Amino acid sequence: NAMLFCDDSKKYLKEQNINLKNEFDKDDKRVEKFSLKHQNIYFDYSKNLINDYILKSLLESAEKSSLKDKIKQMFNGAKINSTEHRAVLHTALRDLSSTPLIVDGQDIRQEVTKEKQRVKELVEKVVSGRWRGFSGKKITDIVNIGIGGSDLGPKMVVRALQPYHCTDLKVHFVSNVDADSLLQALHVVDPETTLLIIASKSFSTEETLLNSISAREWLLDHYEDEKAVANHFVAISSKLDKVKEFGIDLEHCYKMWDWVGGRYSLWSSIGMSIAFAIGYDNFEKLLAGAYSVDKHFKETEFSKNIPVIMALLASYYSCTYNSQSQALLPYDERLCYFVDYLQQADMESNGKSVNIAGETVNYQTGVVLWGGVGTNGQHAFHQLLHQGNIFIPVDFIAIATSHHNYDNHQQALLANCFAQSQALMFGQSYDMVYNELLKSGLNETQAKELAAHKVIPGNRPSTTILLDELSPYSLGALIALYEHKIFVQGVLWDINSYDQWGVELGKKLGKNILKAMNDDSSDEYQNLDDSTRQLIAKVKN
Amino acid sequence: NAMLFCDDSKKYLKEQNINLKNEFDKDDKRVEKFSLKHQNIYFDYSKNLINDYILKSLLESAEKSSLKDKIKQMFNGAKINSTEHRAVLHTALRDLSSTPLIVDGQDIRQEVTKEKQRVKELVEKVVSGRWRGFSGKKITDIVNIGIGGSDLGPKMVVRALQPYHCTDLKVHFVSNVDADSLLQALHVVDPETTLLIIASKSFSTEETLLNSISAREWLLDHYEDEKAVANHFVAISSKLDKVKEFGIDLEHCYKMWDWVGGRYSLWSSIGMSIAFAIGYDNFEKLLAGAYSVDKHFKETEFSKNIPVIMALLASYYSCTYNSQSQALLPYDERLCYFVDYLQQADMESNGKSVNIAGETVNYQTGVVLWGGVGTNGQHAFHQLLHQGNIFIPVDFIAIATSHHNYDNHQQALLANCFAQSQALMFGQSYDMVYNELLKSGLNETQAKELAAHKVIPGNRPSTTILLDELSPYSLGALIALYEHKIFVQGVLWDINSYDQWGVELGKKLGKNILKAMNDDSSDEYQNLDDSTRQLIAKVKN
Numbered sequence A, B: 001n002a003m004l005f006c007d008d009s010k011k012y013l014k015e016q017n018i019n020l021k022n023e024f025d026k027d028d029k030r031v032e033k034f035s036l037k038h039q040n041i042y043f044d045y046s047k048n049l050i051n052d053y054i055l056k057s058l059l060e061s062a063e064k065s066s067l068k069d070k071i072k073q074m075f076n077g078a079k080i081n082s083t084e085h086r087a088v089l090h091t092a093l094r095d096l097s098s099t100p101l102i103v104d105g106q107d108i109r110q111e112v113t114k115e116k117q118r119v120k121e122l123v124e125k126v127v128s129g130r131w132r133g134f135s136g137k138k139i140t141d142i143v144n145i146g147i148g149g150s151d152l153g154p155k156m157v158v159r160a161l162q163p164y165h166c167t168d169l170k171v172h173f174v175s176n177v178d179a180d181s182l183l184q185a186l187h188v189v190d191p192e193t194t195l196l197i198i199a200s201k202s203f204s205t206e207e208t209l210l211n212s213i214s215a216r217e218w219l220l221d222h223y224e225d226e227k228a229v230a231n232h233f234v235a236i237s238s239k240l241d242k243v244k245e246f247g248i249d250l251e252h253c254y255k256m257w258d259w260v261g262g263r264y265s266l267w268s269s270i271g272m273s274i275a276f277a278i279g280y281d282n283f284e285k286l287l288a289g290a291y292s293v294d295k296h297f298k299e300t301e302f303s304k305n306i307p308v309i310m311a312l313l314a315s316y317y318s319c320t321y322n323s324q325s326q327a328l329l330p331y332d333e334r335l336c337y338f339v340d341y342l343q344q345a346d347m348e349s350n351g352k353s354v355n356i357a358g359e360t361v362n363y364q365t366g367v368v369l370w371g372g373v374g375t376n377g378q379h380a381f382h383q384l385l386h387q388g389n390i391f392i393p394v395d396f397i398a399i400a401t402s403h404h405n406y407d408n409h410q411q412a413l414l415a416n417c418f419a420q421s422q423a424l425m426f427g428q429s430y431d432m433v434y435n436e437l438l439k440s441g442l443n444e445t446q447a448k449e450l451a452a453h454k455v456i457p458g459n460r461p462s463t464t465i466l467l468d469e470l471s472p473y474s475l476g477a478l479i480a481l482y483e484h485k486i487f488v489q490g491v492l493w494d495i496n497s498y499d500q501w502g503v504e505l506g507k508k509l510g511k512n513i514l515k516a517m518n519d520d521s522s523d524e525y526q527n528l529d530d531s532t533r534q535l536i537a538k539v540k541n
């Protein structure tokens, strides 16, 4: 009996036939109406296909929904992950409010704070040289072993905050079971000077098991002494009994909890590799930036609430325009893993076909998230954004000031960002193009033959999110805005954003195929479909 | 008057209601019918939503189209890029047939061969130490400066063929105008031991101008002598008069031609950075692998022609299912830039709204290409591939043998690849899930509450392309298959795959915004829409 977001009313808001050029021409308050600020982030949604009536309608849907209650439930530790019967408490990992919070018997404030202090102490001990390897040498390299939620957030943040690296440690990320991943690290690190991190909430993920066993074999090939594991491995898990079983003791184990989703885990002990690159102080700033956004989201009326507006725009488009993707365009090299990161956070959350009650939904839910760094994308897929015939909402991320003094480069980067959103909005008409071709020296026959191919239809929507700089704090705020957008969309679709029963299945598949690959007389091999069977046959011969 | 590909007939082939499980159960020739081989590439399209009637219908469309003629025209140098009045001759860059080919007065065989010999000589001179820097030191580092087509192919191939690196040179890629790109290279290279490559077909691209000027300033800050440019820069262009104007002489300029599209240019002198990593012999093998596929495509009847089948499947889905994206899943770390590369090749080619005649088309053309490396994607967006409600065709790329002896890792990587396609095909029904939950120890109430959330609908399509290994040759074959797929789709849609009037516009935009940013009294500033104006105001203050 939840409110239906994608209803007949939405399908018909589109009939307003918004013309963005006309709106900016006629409404001198357009930017004031359709932009928001949060500290030093400027959120400009004014190039979206909305006017007051459409935004009002969308906000009414949010107000009529369970969203207000669901926000409170999330922060209070209610078990909103209803299919796994878990709280959803990534927010608590970065809390600065210190309000009381007791969940399933645990003082969450105390638990979070104590574990941070343990990570901070480990980083300090390693960076200061108090932690030595088994042969007594100072550590110079950190290798994180993990996949998915135990890999991509730390990897993305370490890159994004490269200018802030300050520990004299090189941090490497091993993830894929493809041994190329492990080898890229092992080829450049020395067993006597490397600390290995086994990052795994479950401690039973195939890839991370195989990679950790292989890394341990490499370490022990060198030292020929099992006692060396103590100086060269730590673990991060919710499953401490399983860590001990691998050979790492509790004093070398760092906790996370069931209420930390992998794709929302960089804020937890899983982020230790981030601290090892940028120092713990900068890791605290990353968390504080997210807290600022958490407070904004929790406390702000929906009409002025950035994540809510992000979510309403996105779901409006995917409902009313039947779009099946969204483009995210970060105009900063440091954000080269940001699309990949959000692709996981978004699609793994909201790629769901049933509602909370288990009913198959008759409306589309999460769509594909993709994109690429600017300005490079302008040379590639922006062609399709300008002249294809696919409706695609676009977010640009711009950073006002960079980390260097090549001011001409930075000005050009921003000019291009703003030009691209402007060009999506205006396009270029046949008449404009034709007259420009004549002015360039083409005769009338030539200009008539070419002009239609240069028409850019325009009236295509975009949002621009402008940060003052890309610091630990502003990056943390930026990620948190999208975390909450994803949450709001899930609420409005009445799905569970926090389970992943397709990912869970993936972790159990192909034990059967491995068995088949190793014995063609097995039941497993006999029961194969023939496509799988002939693929296996081809990798044998 | 071209044949309409997306017609009523296609929309109705879907009514066959293909059930993949049922097809494999009942048809013991399914794999034989719906797979092809080209040398050591196996193309298995049998998990697609086709049967004989659907494939026949699609092949009839190809046979009825202009495709047969268009293939001949492409290879013969006809001006199939009709809006720029250019030939489309990336094929000629890798030719081994030596058949006569004269285009716009040039012997293309002689031109291509002579330029290869020049690149080969440069690489040999640099690697042998015959080429010295201005202070007499051997070169140790190569920096390619270029963007889009002058960046991404070389960058992707250099990574993909990392195991084959053999010149003792480190190759770096500078592209974005964001000065972070240039700085990542300059921070790790020495002016006295670095050769800089200015890669630009036009020699007038904003980003590459600014990056090249900045690199030259860095070089000259060190040497304080303009004569040093001679030992530290080469250029690749179709516009040799513009190179001279920058200060590089003709003997240091390497040619490409107007008939080499940027996004099809790695095969040309633009690929020099690839040769500088892997040696010229391996670069020749890359080209030979593409030639093998060119010969396949040119000579093979459509029913057995891999690129044609790829194109027909893709366009069938995007027509009949109204899908707006395709997923590409490379199960090898070395292919980490492959999706990005093909995203450019595909979307920039086929993101077009008008046909060859300039008429606005009433059918959808190119769709979004996205994806990610396996197995990592299984932990992230595969959730949406399994349980979302978006129809998305999927290609998997598998490599039978890797470059190391971690055979357990490689077997697991392949098992996972094949398991994922198998799981897309079969899914898991309510009954299967429910009975598994009971067997795990849940009672009936608990199993009923959870089961619907674990249902995986299945009957989702995939193709698997299996290579024997990822070598220069097999990579070249792989890229060429997709080049030709894109070509075939464009033909069937009656669009020009080879222009990019949205990218061309991008290169001219925001001169106006830069002018506005530098003078708020300008006409440019006054004429701004207010969203752009307030964004500029915010990056001032």
Ligand SMILES: O=C(O)[C@H](O)[C@@H](O)[C@H](O)[C@H](O)COP(=O)(O)O
Binding pocket: A147, A148, A149, A150, A199, A200, A201, A202, A203, A204, A205, A208, A261, A262, A263, A264, A348, A500, A503, B379, B380
């Ligand atoms: O939260 C998520 O997005 C997923 O559950 C998944 O990506 C998970 O993080 C990995 O499978 C690693 O799991 P472990 O941390 O348990 O090894």
Ligand SMILES: O=C(O)[C@H](O)[C@@H](O)[C@H](O)[C@H](O)COP(=O)(O)O
Binding pocket: A379, A380, B147, B148, B149, B150, B199, B200, B201, B202, B203, B204, B205, B208, B261, B262, B263, B264, B348, B500, B503
């Ligand atoms: O072919 C392409 O895909 C595009 O035309 C574009 O990506 C182009 O390669 C770049 O804009 C660099 O152009 P230059 O090589 O002329 O600098």
Ligand SMILES: [Ca+2]
Binding pocket: A063, A064, A065, A068
């Ligand atoms: Ca209400």
Ligand SMILES: [Ca+2]
Binding pocket: B063, B064, B065, B068
């Ligand atoms: Ca025919």
